[PDB]
Write a protein that holds these residues in place. Structure first.
Motif, PDB file in Angstrom:
ATOM      1  N   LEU A 264       0.785  -1.247   0.167  1.00  0.00           N
ATOM      2  CA  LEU A 264      -0.036   0.101   0.049  1.00  0.00           C
ATOM      3  C   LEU A 264       0.838   1.436  -0.092  1.00  0.00           C
ATOM      4  N   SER A 265       0.301   2.085  -0.741  1.00  0.00           N
ATOM      5  CA  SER A 265       0.997   3.486  -0.802  1.00  0.00           C
ATOM      6  C   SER A 265       0.674   4.454   0.194  1.00  0.00           C
ATOM      7  N   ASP A 266       1.132   5.955   0.177  1.00  0.00           N
ATOM      8  CA  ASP A 266       1.000   6.693   1.166  1.00  0.00           C
ATOM      9  C   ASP A 266       0.033   7.662   0.625  1.00  0.00           C
ATOM     10  N   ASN A 267      -0.732   7.359  -0.680  1.00  0.00           N
ATOM     11  CA  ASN A 267      -1.440   8.168  -1.275  1.00  0.00           C
ATOM     12  C   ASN A 267      -2.979   7.464  -0.984  1.00  0.00           C
TER      13      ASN A 267
ATOM     14  N   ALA B 197      -3.354   5.103   1.710  1.00  0.00           N
ATOM     15  CA  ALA B 197      -3.561   4.972   3.194  1.00  0.00           C
ATOM     16  C   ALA B 197      -4.706   5.693   3.703  1.00  0.00           C
TER      17      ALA B 197
ATOM     18  N   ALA C 274      -5.494   4.258   7.540  1.00  0.00           N
ATOM     19  CA  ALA C 274      -5.095   4.080   8.901  1.00  0.00           C
ATOM     20  C   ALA C 274      -3.808   4.770   9.135  1.00  0.00           C
ATOM     21  N   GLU C 275      -3.831   5.478  10.330  1.00  0.00           N
ATOM     22  CA  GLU C 275      -2.707   6.465  10.679  1.00  0.00           C
ATOM     23  C   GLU C 275      -1.527   5.545  11.443  1.00  0.00           C
TER      24      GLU C 275
END
Lengths: 125, 94
Positions: free
Chosen positions: A36-39, A41, A43-44
């Motif tokens: 999974l990417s950070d774009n 996401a 969940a923190e």
């Protein structure tokens, strides 16, 4: 060359399957699984990624093919719930994400005949 | 700018989460004194290790305008077709 396209070796983790008769390998919808990417996401909290410990070939139960038998199905990821540390991580975590390499094995001599469809149906209600 | 100029807008988005790591510092970001009348500015990254997340959420249905600007029923009034002798041939509302 010395290559043949009938021999294939898949090594993943500490588990290697070899096969000397196969026809290629189907990558579902052209896309290879990845993290999974950070774009995308939501969940923190920081994800855990167990890498080698939870990626490796889990041999599930094997049923006998007979002349009269009609077919079989298994449901994923539900099936893997007792498989080692995959099972454990799945048991202690609310959210999980993963892709899968499905490898069905069967064999017979030249004087047998028969043909099985192997299909992965997403969202089979 | 002007709130009667409706073609002039602005844009802002909800804050992102920056990745943090473990600490063993001498600073406490989650201790505060309520008495002050000051609301704490703690954010998740102060008490967990968080990943980097980008938010593109935008507060846009909680603007005062958008909240209040929908047509509400305030009153209904009734009146018959009558003559001058009737006292229900017209009606009024304060």
């Amino acid at each position: 060359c010395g290559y043949s396209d009938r021999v294939r070796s898949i090594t993943l983790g500490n588990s290697t399957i070899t096969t000397q008769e196969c026809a290629n390998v189907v990558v579902g919808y052209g896309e290879w699984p990845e993290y999974l990417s950070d774009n995308e996401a939501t969940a923190e909290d920081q994800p855990t990624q167990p890498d080698v410990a939870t990626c490796r070939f889990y041999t599930l139960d094997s049923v006998q093919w007979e002349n009269g038998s009609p077919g079989w199905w298994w449901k994923f990821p539900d099936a893997l719930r007792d498989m080692g540390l995959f099972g454990q991580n799945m048991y202690y975590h609310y959210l999980g994400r993963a892709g899968y390499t499905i490898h069905v094995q069967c064999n017979a001599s030249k004087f047998h005949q028969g043909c099985i469809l192997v299909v992965c149906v997403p969202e089979a209600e | 700018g002007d709130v009667q100029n409706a073609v002039e807008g602005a844009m802002v988005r909800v804050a992102d989460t920056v990745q943090t790591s473990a600490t063993n510092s001498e600073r406490v970001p989650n201790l505060t004194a309520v008495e002050t009348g000051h609301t704490s500015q703690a954010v998740p990254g102060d008490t967990m290790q968080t990943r980097h997340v980008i938010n593109n959420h935008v507060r846009s249905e909680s603007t005062i305008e958008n909240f209040l600007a929908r047509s509400a029923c305030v009153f209904y009034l009734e009146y018959k077709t009558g003559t001058k002798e009737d006292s229900n041939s017209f009606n009024n509302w304060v």
